[PDB]
Design a protein around this nucleic acid. Structure first.
Ligand code: MG
Ligand code: MG
Ligand code: MG
Lengths: 106, 117, 65, 99, 88
RNA sequence: CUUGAGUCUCGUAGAGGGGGGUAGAAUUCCAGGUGUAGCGGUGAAAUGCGUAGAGAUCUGGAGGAAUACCGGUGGCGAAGGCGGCCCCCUGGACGAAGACUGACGCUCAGGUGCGAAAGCGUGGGGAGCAAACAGGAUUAGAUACCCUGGUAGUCCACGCCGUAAACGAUGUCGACUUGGAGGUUGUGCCCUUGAGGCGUGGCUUCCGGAGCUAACGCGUUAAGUCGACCGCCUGGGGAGUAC
């Protein structure tokens, strides 16, 4: 497993599964040695530039030391699934568990 | 027929050609002014003076719907474009803003070769 | 003129929208360190950081969008 | 070469460098060039540029010198933009476009 | 390229002790492992000539060591060449 | 023997490479909407093209192509070179610190590769661009340049091809010798400490001493001093040609 910081958004309207899918996603984390070092959700936030004619996307973040494979199916999932509206996955030198500029406002 | 009262026009401040259009507040452009269409041709169509005079053609369509405000766009850096803006201020129609919106790409389109002497 | 060093961040978290907005014009073009006097690596870090935030929709490509 | 003919092509090139490539703009405006007056052999170019700066020599003067101060640098720009062996001497003139 | 852990495993057996890190043996063994990792990359990436350039920089390296070793004690060489299963 | 050489551990920057993704403009097309009399072209027209409603505007889609700002002496590289974001793979550089190996070296004919663009091959793909060719604008050589088009080509994949003013028009390595100003990137110390003060590495730049050079200049990133190996030339034309 290796470090990552991950953020994506689901369509604001599909927020019914948004609380569960996270851990339902961490099913991979929780079930494949995923050491989630941090996780953040920010909720609907107005998009600076509209994506796919959508606004106020449901912002969410993750911080994990994860193995090479898990992330893959994890993002292909996103690539597969459609409730999510945009995705992102970046490696991190080390684990980040400090208030993030989004949450640090709170 | 229907009043709009919030003027929004589109101009095409090209070098060799000078053309303004009248637009409805929600897109739907309605009516236009072509300085080339006035019969001005070649250098005469491109003259800044032709662009300044083309105000009357834009104004008559604006008068028909009786629109007042001014939210117009400029695309292209035409010669003496500021003088055309001065002519719109000389007209005395209430001005809210002008937008310098010459479109800039990321170099994605392949440019054509420049002409030579 | 060593202002990022005064902040003390050798690595600049990209999620810092408030710093990014100062380094972003109304159009959204990145101001150079010619006038901001920032050191290159941070300049380097900021340019890559702005694009990724822009992809995430944190930063606008241009208001006209 | 034929000056009255090359003038049209040069004016387009002068406008492109003037609008997107500026970091000392005392004008700080979309200044538009009414006309150019290249000499035979294009040795000297007279650039008559109107100023969106309220058409007052006070604001206009700020830019015309700014137009003249950065000339060698901008020379390079237009000088490497039309494959010209003649890099035109640069001169700047507020035009009384409005009378 | 490698994992420090794999390098440590090679150093423990090929080297006399963990500190013994220059011994020609402990050198050629690491180079051979590095070539194997690069060969897996080249199997799908033949285009990546740039990485092949280094590939050369080492196959020749041990090649020099081999000789340097071979001209030093074939004894170790002889076992080394078969210890590393090379030049069979 | 250990300083040459090289390994280990600690980092560290980097448009290095290969792959796979993905974004946003732009352009074209297409969709609509509203909305027209033109449009674009020239020095002027022609040429183009419009009531099928074009031209313009929004809204949408499709496609292909390339990645603005940042961004520059700024890096990365043997060089050709490398410029959107992500992930996978992978080369090298460098610092620090200590250990390990112990001359394990340099150069290289022959050698094997590497390789700008166009070009050849197959099959791809097709925005935009543009040789060829095409319509209008001509005679000092108009054979035109200009505008209007436009296939190949331009992209991919795999192939060939192996040359470019592939240029620092400066072979490789090592050593030695005045300066100053930069940049860059390391890192030590000492100040709380940014800044600051001492450093000390790497790489890069501009002057510039001596020295050298026909001169031009070069100038510790020498064309100064030296060393080692390689490569090459011997008036010019014929001629990098006949064969
Ligand atoms: Mg090509
Ligand atoms: Mg050659
Ligand atoms: Mg070259």
């Amino acid at each position: 497993m290796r470090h990552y910081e991950i953020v994506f958004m689901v369509h604001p309207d599909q927020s019914e599964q948004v609380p569960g899918m996270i851990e339902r996603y961490t099913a991979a984390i929780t079930g494949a040695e995923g050491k989630i070092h941090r996780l953040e959700d920010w909720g609907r936030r107005q998009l600076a530039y509209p994506i796919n004619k959508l606004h106020k996307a449901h912002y969410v973040l993750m911080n994990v030391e994860a193995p090479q494979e898990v992330i893959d199916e994890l993002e292909t999932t996103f690539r597969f699934n459609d409730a999510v509206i945009r995705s992102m996955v970046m490696r991190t030198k080390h684990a980040v568990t400090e208030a993030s500029p989004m949450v640090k406002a709170k | 027929r229907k009043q709009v009262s919030d003027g929004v026009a589109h101009i095409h401040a090209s070098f060799n050609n000078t053309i303004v259009t009248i637009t409805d507040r929600q897109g739907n452009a309605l009516g236009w002014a072509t300085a080339g269409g006035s019969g001005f041709r070649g250098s005469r169509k491109s003259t800044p003076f032709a662009a300044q005079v083309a105000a009357e053609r834009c104004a008559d369509a604006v008068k028909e719907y009786g629109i007042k405000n001014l939210e117009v766009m400029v695309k292209g850096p035409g010669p003496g474009r500021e003088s055309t803006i001065r002519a719109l201020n000389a007209a005395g129609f209430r001005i809210t803003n002008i937008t310098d919106v010459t479109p800039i790409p990321h170099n994605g389109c392949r440019p054509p070769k420049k002409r030579r002497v | 003129f060593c202002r990022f060093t005064a902040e003390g961040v050798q690595e600049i978290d990209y999620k810092d929208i408030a710093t990014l907005k100062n380094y972003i014009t109304e159009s959204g073009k990145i101001v150079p360190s010619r006038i901001t006097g920032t050191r290159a690596k941070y300049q380097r870090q900021l340019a890559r950081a702005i694009k990724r935030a822009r992809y995430l929709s944190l930063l606008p490509y241009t208001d006209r969008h | 070469g034929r000056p009255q003919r090359v003038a049209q092509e040069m004016q387009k090139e002068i406008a492109l460098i003037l609008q997107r490539e500026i970091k000392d703009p005392r004008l700080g405006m979309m200044t538009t060039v009414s006309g150019v007056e290249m000499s035979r052999d294009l040795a000297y170019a007279k650039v008559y540029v109107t100023f969106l700066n309220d058409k007052d020599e006070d604001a206009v003067k700020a830019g015309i010198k700014a137009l003249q101060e950065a000339s060698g640098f901008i020379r390079s720009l237009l000088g490497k933009a039309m494959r010209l062996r003649i890099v035109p001497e640069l001169t700047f003139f507020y035009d009384n476009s409005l009378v | 390229s490698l994992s420090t852990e794999a390098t440590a495993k090679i150093v423990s057996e090929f080297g006399r002790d963990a500190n013994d890190t220059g011994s020609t043996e402990v050198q050629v063994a690491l180079l051979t492992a590095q070539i194997n990792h690069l060969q897996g990359h080249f199997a799908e990436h033949k285009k990546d000539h740039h990485s092949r350039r280094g590939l050369l920089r080492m196959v020749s390296q041990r090649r020099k060591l081999l000789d340097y070793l071979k001209r030093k004690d074939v004894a170790r060489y002889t076992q080394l060449i078969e210890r590393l299963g090379l030049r069979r």
